[PDB]
Amino acid sequence: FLGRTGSSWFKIFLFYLIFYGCLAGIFIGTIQVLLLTLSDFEPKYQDRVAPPGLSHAPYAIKTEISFSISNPKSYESFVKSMHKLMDLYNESSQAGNSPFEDCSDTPADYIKRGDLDDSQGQKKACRFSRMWLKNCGYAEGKPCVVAKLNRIIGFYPKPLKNTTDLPEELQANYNQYVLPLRCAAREKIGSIEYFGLGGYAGFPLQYYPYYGKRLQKKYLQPLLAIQFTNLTQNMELRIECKVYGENIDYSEKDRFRGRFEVKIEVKS
């Protein structure tokens, strides 16, 4: 033929069949032992998610949400993702004492449901009403963005203490139980309005620590609705929403490390 005879062509096939078969069987074996060394409830390493990311619902083309108020299908793209998220926080999804629980309607302290063990059933998560998100189809004019803190197993988000000076200096400082979120731009051509649990501009600490998908399915993380009823129009406004805390840090590279990058433009 090309290389060899039929007899040789066969033998080279019988070899590579057994050979690659063995190699596949060995590869699988090493994957088995790897998995055997891992927990079902907690990942081996968490230093790469460490400082929590802050992500929002409006799917930004490039950290930007520009549209026209005087146009219907101009914002119907951002309403798709906005709906996708809030559709999960339905009351019909949170039914019965299992696996949900009614928690303080005001920001409270942490809740420990034991260890990362299966020695108990599904760890009961705090309910969250999308109805706590006042004012927010969504904002056809002047968007109503929804913030979110990235989930990390066993992470206890710790707010800053009012020992020294603060950006939003001491205003509504629920020091003990709220992780604040203050959006900014100089360039003050807007109108910041925050909505959340208990009416505070933060995340209620009663939703922590997260026990993971395996030990807490259907779990709901707290949301923080933000509305920009800015009196300006037809210009790119670089708005940055920042979260503050002891366990919260940022990076010049990762522009989502505990903060937002939104470029709103109501070009109408």
Binding site: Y45, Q46, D47, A50, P51, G154, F155, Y156, K158, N247
Partner: protein, 39 residues
Amino acid sequence: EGPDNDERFTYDYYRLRVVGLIVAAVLCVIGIIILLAGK
């Protein structure tokens, strides 16, 4: 610890780099020694 389990989300990449560079250097020296056993 409980709420004070910050060490869980931390890794000393600084020491690791110091050690890694020490090792790389020493392996580089060892190599020169064996090569220079006759030039």
